[PDB]
Subunit: 468 residues, 2 copies
């Protein structure tokens, strides 16, 4: 039942009030926040707000030293991305790109599945995986209403494509922002090593491989009659024409998005001040002053504030802050040092086995919790391991955060799967059967990526000095 | 027109790019953000996000040193207050307290006005002045539909009562939180001198005086037939019974609110860690696990997350951060020192005249802009003045922030007045005529308060050492 999850663990709080060793107190905080992460008896952001409420009582950190960790460059970056995504959503743009791509590739189940997967991934690279699948599934439903395995195939394709595309852009989804925050906190001498450009270079090639493998696996398991070609076009056309002409505002938001991309990349092809958060905020601001209509007086702009107050995941701006506060408390108390001293004997196990095992463990784990909690709970542990054995932490921290996005079964794993399920014929057993193999595929692809071309970018074959 | 406000000022940006003196650059940033404060061509939060976008370009602060100033104890305090206010709003509680008070005082225009003003003030002490007036005006409309001066009187009473009650609790409204943030930033050795208790002691007596004077002034200007007594009761009763019985959840939220009050006060009747933000977060968290219904299984709690994501002013969590970033940039660049050296000659003007003049200036100013922008623009200036002449900064910083809430004409001054106007018969001239006198009243009351009983609490007759 739901009662025990937050009444029995609290009963241990008087146990550890004295506990003349702060790292025990920080460990209890982390364990409690993890127990509340996996089961949502209490929402995620509320659990993120717990460190300010517990570190003081445990005499670890003051209230200010804890709260001033809840906003940093990473949160601003994610917030700017979210606002741009709101601008994209308000004007039905993505529903235009998608419905043009579908009419381009064709109306054939083999090609139609590829179109849906590719579109969903490309959108999810910037558009908050949940939202893009929420937008795309209705199109699939409309098509289907006009065997029993095509339905499952397409429904799974939406979610897998979203979860895979998300792990290409540093914004993408929470886990990558969490990685950036942990790198800035634990390893601050890494001024800018995981940027938008570096992460995009390391990860974008990977998601193409994962998408190809997923498409092959799906068309092998569920696909192993011209009406379904001549009656899906009659739906795509009649759901495309409803969008009207090119909608002048869409052009301006597209231009702003391209400017955002160009500024993110061109920046990194003397006392830098101008990190990517500045760019994201710049474009988010520009979105409020652009006309959105032909002046012929300045017509109503692209974005009001009501829209971006109603439609913005603000809780994921506190969740990452909770992660950062946890990292700060771990550094202050002495938990990271203890974990480092308790993981020396791993100096004999070869690093590749460590990376593979931990990636598989994280992939299994994230089918129960959310994909952000997994990272903010695991990454400090792997970072402490790496310092103590003589590795470059990125070796173990990149595949882990890529794997945390491998939620391919257990609808509870990530919202997209739940959204896909809500529509009917996607019995859960099918998800498990088709998702275990996809988790294996993702782990193999990630291992290949990190061991082949992620070593030249980050120099993972040497032990640096920003990890003392 | 709206075009010039954000295309001509930007044209000065290339002028000051070089400008081998950082304080000029910080001054330009502040002036631009002020110009965008007064006229809302670009929303307020977006302007608050500007420092991260401009200080880097001007080589004042990095992006992290700027963004890590956007969350602090004050923002958490205000956020907890906001969440509790959401819990109050979701269950129509305040509409129960109010409609019981109205039936208690009576149905007579003289007594009815007092009931409305007192209720609106008491609610606004915790409930985000805008929201309480939004809730209360419909009751007045319902009553009126069943001379032409009663309408104006009641409509003005709602807004004046809200704006006056807000300035009693440290949360209350933005200006007081801004004062707390500026005290923590500019004067950090003032560990805890303006708390909830101290501010409540200094300000709560003042708002009773202001409410009494406002009620007298209104009943003198607009009030200088038993049907209006026997047909407002027939409305209050029929709008009270619709609320049903005491609504078990209301009891629990009331208990949580009382616990919040008791924890805020009892705390201050060795290396403190437990500032009021901890209490606010504690109660905000408790609001998510309390049943909200009789278990008889844990029924749905008082607060979900959808409700507190839809209904929470998140932008005022970035606005205060913008204020703090401005203060940090002023300290870093060298603008505060310059302003201190340019305000020595005021060492001859007696302090009381300074306080009165500045309070009146701020009261006039805040009839154009918002009440938060005024404080975050003025308070650093007054703080720099005080250090250089030999005063206790609170002397000039308390009345200024109390006066910034004196928006009693010019609907654009603060949202409550606009809400009141939207209902009809409140011609603007009436607002000016009845508001100039009320601004004078507020200034006089504030001067009396600070000069009589605000000197013992804060020791304003000596120059401390937390102001070097
Ligand atoms: C509680 C709120 C509403 C603030 C919230 C928190 C976390 C997410 C996760 C979004 C995700 O990153 C998926 C993932 O991380 O599992 C994606 O892009 O779909 C979404 C919303
Ligand atoms: C832009 C958003 C929506 C974030 C926003 C900003 C500022 C306020 C002010 C609230 C005020 O403090 C009045 C006052 O300060 O003028 C009160 O309590 O009514 C309200 C909302
Ligand atoms: C930094 O490096 C020094 C030299 O090995 C090491 O002793 C010290 O513990 C390290 N400090 C941190 C904060 O990593
Ligand atoms: C603190 O006090 C010293 C002594 O007067 C003064 O010289 C110095 O400028 C002050 N520093 C700050 C940061 O106020
Ligand atoms: Na995404
Ligand atoms: Na998951
Ligand atoms: Na208020
Ligand atoms: Na105002």
């Amino acid at each position: 039942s739901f009662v025990i999850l937050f009444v029995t663990p609290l009963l241990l709080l008087p146990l550890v009030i004295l506990m003349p060793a702060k790292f025990v107190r920080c460990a209890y905080v982390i364990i409690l926040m993890a127990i509340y992460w996996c089961t949502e008896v209490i929402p995620l952001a509320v659990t993120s707000l717990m460190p300010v409420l517990l570190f003081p009582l445990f005499q670890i950190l003051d209230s200010r030293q804890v709260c001033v960790q809840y906003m940093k460059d990473t949160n601003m970056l994610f917030l700017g991305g979210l606002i741009v995504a709101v601008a994209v959503e308000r004007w039905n743009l993505h529903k235009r790109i998608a419905l043009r791509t579908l009419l381009w590739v064709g109306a054939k189940p083999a090609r139609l599945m590829l179109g849906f997967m590719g579109v969903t991934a490309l959108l999810s690279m910037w558009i908050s995986n949940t939202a893009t699948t929420a937008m795309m599934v209705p199109i699939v439903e409309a098509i289907l209403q006009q065997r029993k395995r095509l339905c499952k195939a397409m429904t799974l394709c939406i979610c897998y494509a979203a979860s895979i595309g998300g792990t290409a852009t540093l914004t993408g989804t929470g886990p990558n922002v969490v990685l950036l925050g942990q790198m800035n906190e634990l390893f601050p001498d890494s001024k800018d090593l995981v940027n938008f450009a570096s992460w995009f270079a390391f990860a974008f090639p990977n998601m193409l491989v994962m998408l190809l493998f997923a498409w092959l696996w799906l068309q092998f398991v569920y696909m192993r009659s011209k009406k379904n070609e001549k009656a899906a076009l009659k739906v795509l056309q009649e759901e495309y024409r409803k969008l009207g002409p090119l909608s002048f505002a869409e052009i301006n938001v597209l231009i702003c998005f391209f400017l955002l991309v160009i500024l993110w990349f061109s920046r990194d092809p003397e006392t830098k001040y101008v990190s990517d958060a500045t760019v994201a905020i710049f474009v988010a601001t520009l979105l409020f002053i652009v006309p959105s209509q032909k002046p012929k007086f300045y017509p109503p702009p692209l974005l009001d504030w009501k829209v971006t107050q109603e439609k913005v995941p603000w809780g994921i701006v506190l969740l990452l802050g909770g992660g950062f506060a946890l990292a700060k408390g771990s550094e202050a108390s002495g938990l990271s040092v203890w974990m480092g001293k308790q993981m020396e004997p791993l100096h004999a196990v070869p690093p590749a086995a460590i990376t593979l095992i931990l990636s598989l463990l994280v992939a299994v784990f994230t089918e129960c919790t959310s994909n952000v909690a997994t990272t903010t709970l695991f990454l400090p542990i792997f970072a402490s391991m790496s310092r103590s054995i003589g590795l470059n932490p990125l070796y173990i921290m990149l595949p882990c955060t890529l794997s945390a996005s491998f939620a391919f079964m257990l609808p509870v794993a990530t919202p997209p799967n739940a959204i896909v399920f809500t529509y009917g014929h996607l019995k859960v057993a099918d998800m498990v059967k088709t998702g275990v193999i996809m988790n294996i595929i993702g782990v193999f692809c990630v291992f290949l990526a990190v061991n082949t071309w992620g070593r030249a970018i980050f120099d993972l074959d040497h032990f640096p000095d920003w990890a003392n």
